């Protein structure tokens, strides 16, 4: 009876697929076909973060627009002071591979993760003076990809295992668990109302979830290969994606489909990072070829490069009031560009 | 300096960040670090007699061997996080002919890898004195899994140990030119290859180790010089 | 969406041949490395074949050296193995596999319990 099931979703793909070209009326090129070309959007390094000792993998922009933390294989998490280039802490790590790293948006937790499968909490402002570990999450079964804070006793992770989890920091414990992907889930993307989120996995699938019931709302596919990154555009009805495919995607949740791609002939390289501006005008990527490109959204027309690094560009984030951005690469530097 | 008292403090307290960050950095660059890879029966976890981590000490330098086994069978992802490391230790089990096939197409893989490009391998074949038992008892036969062995004849280079078979060297250096075929045709001098013989109660793996972490670091330091 | 269809497997008397297809959509065929792997009952996955983008480099494995033959229609975007004089352990389920990642030539994974760049394969009796 194997075969009836598999007939069964083949006729349920067959419906959904005719459904979504039922809404293809136009296309975004033709809607944005009149629109005047942002023109030349050129951006220069203000700052150069130096003290990293190995590859960056994870950086995480503060609220306040001017702390950030950043994670490099040597074993240490650095607080940075964008505005005088200072060093507020550092944490060494009990595991040296870490792969991910969030800034609690109230600004007194920091967490990371990486190849030894634990979520670890750490306590900036305590009596004592020191950054200490205040809770050591378990319970996945592969490397930690991604986590985000929603608050101060919730968090969201990303998982090798193929799933992702919400979890309570109080009691350690796995609130809710998502599953569904076929592959390692490496990216996920907090909605700005934190009731919805996207997660992107290696298998050119990207799976939107709702936080307080736990199923997957919408199913986008399109790439060809392994999802590296992907980034929610700012109102909250669309986001990017990038992949090894070396093309950008923009799927609209309302109209469950992609609308507009980013990729060039001369690109062969897979995306490394994605973000949007604050306006969400311009789309800011990452890639393998040592290079950031800057996309116009609205007409996937490049605009500009940021050609500062040596080696391939980890992480990439745009701040909270849009004025700059960092880039962090395996050459063991970070990079503001204004 | 046109800085307040408060924000001078700061700047003295990054730099006391900053001294620890040098000691660790000079701790950290001292130490190499080493990642053990080799499927299941291979004998991996010994082969030195000093699991995700362990310490080892040769003639005052140190080494540090990472074995990831705790994650999915892909690793496709998580293997670029070792393209800093010095070497690439492959186990290999040198006696089971229905599983070397497999055992190539993995060495295959890592030697061709876009982010282990740089990264030199040092390939251990164990397990020799079972293929040596298994050669002169005549039950199997690798012209069964490799037809090429019939038109194979033993390297002039190659070393007979101070009593043996000839029919057992054939076969450790059938099985060693394998990897080694596969190892000379994408190298392009930038890595290379270090094949050994060891056995289970062999002893002598951490100092073939040593020599050769420091063939690596001299044809690295050789080329970044811009010398070779 | 990325679709692998195998088709042209069956039950033959040894010493036959037997001509395996696959079908590949929702990508560009012409940008990928393609592999025929095969799984035997009480054994796991085990690589066969392997063919690259233009065809040039093709690659078998030892038993099959010489009796089959692998094949590639870039225009027509099918993957096609060509399997002659057919020993009793040949029969298997037969998969073609796509490598992760474009313009590569190193393929991670294809004989992994549960790669989604695969297809449902096509069981083959001798």
């Known amino acids: 009876e194997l075969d009836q099931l598999r007939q069964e979703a083949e006729q349920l793909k067959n419906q959904i697929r005719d459904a979504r070209k039922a809404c293809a009326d136009a296309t975004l090129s033709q809607i944005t076909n009149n629109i005047d070309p942002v023109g030349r959007i050129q951006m220069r390094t203000r700052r150069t973060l130096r003290g990293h000792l190995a590859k960056i993998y994870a950086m995480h922009w503060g609220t306040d627009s001017r702390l950030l933390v950043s994670a490099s294989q040597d074993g240490k998490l650095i607080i940075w002071d964008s505005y005088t280039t200072n060093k507020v802490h550092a944490i060494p790590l009990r595991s040296s591979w870490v792969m991910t790293c969030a800034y609690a948006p109230s600004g007194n937790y920091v967490a990371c993760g990486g190849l030894d499968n634990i979520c670890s909490i750490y306590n900036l402002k305590t009596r004592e003076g020191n950054v200490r570990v205040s809770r050591e999450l378990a319970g996945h079964t592969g490397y930690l990809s991604c986590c985000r804070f929603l608050d101060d006793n919730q968090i969201v992770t990303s998982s090798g295992d193929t799933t992702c989890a919400l979890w309570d920091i109080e009691t350690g414990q796995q609130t809710t668990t998502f599953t569904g992907h076929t592959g390692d889930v490496m990216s996920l993307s907090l909605a700005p109302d934190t009731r919805l989120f996207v997660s992107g996995a290696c298998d050119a699938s990207a799976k939107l979830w709702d936080v307080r019931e736990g199923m997957c709302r919408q199913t986008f596919t399109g790439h060809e290969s392994d999802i590296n990154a992907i980034c929610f555009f700012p109102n909250g009805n669309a986001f990017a994606t990038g992949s090894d495919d070396a093309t950008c995607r923009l799927f609209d949740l309302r109209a469950d489909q992609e609308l507009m791609t980013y990729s060039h002939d001369n690109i062969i390289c897979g995306i490394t990072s994605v973000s949007f501006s604050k306006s969400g005008r311009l789309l800011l990527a990452g890639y393998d070829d040592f290079n950031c490109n800057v996309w116009d959204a609205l007409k996937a027309d490049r605009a500009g490069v940021l050609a500062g690094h040596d080696n391939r560009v980890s992480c990439l984030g745009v701040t909270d009031d849009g004025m700059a951005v960092a880039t962090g690469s395996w050459d063991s530097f970070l990079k503001i560009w204004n | 300096c046109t800085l307040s008292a408060e924000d001078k403090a700061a700047v003295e307290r990054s730099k006391m960040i900053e001294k620890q960050l040098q000691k660790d950095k000079q701790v950290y660059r001292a130490t190499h670090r080493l990642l053990l890879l080799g499927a299941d029966n291979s004998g991996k976890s010994t082969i030195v007699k000093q699991i995700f981590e362990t310490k080892f000490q040769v003639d005052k330098v140190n080494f540090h061997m990472f074995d990831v086994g705790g994650q999915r069978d892909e690793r496709r992802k998580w293997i670029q996080c070792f393209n800093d490391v010095t070497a690439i230790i492959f186990v290999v089990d040198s006696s089971d002919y229905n599983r070397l096939q497999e055992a190539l197409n993995d060495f295959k893989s890592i030697w061709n890898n876009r982010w282990l490009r740089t990264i030199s391998v040092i390939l251990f074949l164990n397990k020799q004195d079972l293929l040596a038992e298994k050669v002169l008892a005549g039950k199997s036969k690798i012209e069964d899994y490799f037809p090429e062995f019939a038109r194979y004849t033993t390297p002039e280079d190659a070393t007979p140990e101070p009593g043996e078979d000839p029919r057992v060297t054939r076969a450790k250096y059938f099985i060693r030119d394998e990897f080694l075929r596969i190892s000379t045709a994408s190298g392009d001098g930038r890595h290379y290859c270090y094949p050994h013989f060891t056995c289970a109660v062999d002893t002598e793996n951490a100092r073939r180790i040593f020599n050769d972490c420091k063939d690596i670091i001299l044809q690295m330091n050789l080329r970044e010089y811009n010398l070779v | 969406q990325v679709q692998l269809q195998e088709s042209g497997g069956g039950l033959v008397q040894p010493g036959g041949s037997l001509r395996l297809s696959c079908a590949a959509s929702?990508?560009?065929?012409?940008?990928?490395?393609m592999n025929w792997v095969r799984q035997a009952p009480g054994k796991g996955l085990e690589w066969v074949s392997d063919?690259?983008?233009?065809?040039?480099?093709?690659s078998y494995t030892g038993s099959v050296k010489g009796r089959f033959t692998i094949s590639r229609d870039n225009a027509k975007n099918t993957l096609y193995l060509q399997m002659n004089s057919l020993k009793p352990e040949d029969t298997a389920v037969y998969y073609c596999?796509?490598?992760?990642?474009?313009?590569?030539?190193?393929?991670?994974?294809?004989?992994?319990?549960?790669?989604?760049?695969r297809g449902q394969g096509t069981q083959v009796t001798v």
């Open positions: 596999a796509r490598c992760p990642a474009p313009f590569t030539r190193d393929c991670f994974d294809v004989t992994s319990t549960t790669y989604a760049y």
């Open positions: 929702g990508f560009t065929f012409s940008n990928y490395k």
């Open positions: 063919i690259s983008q233009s065809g040039a480099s093709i």
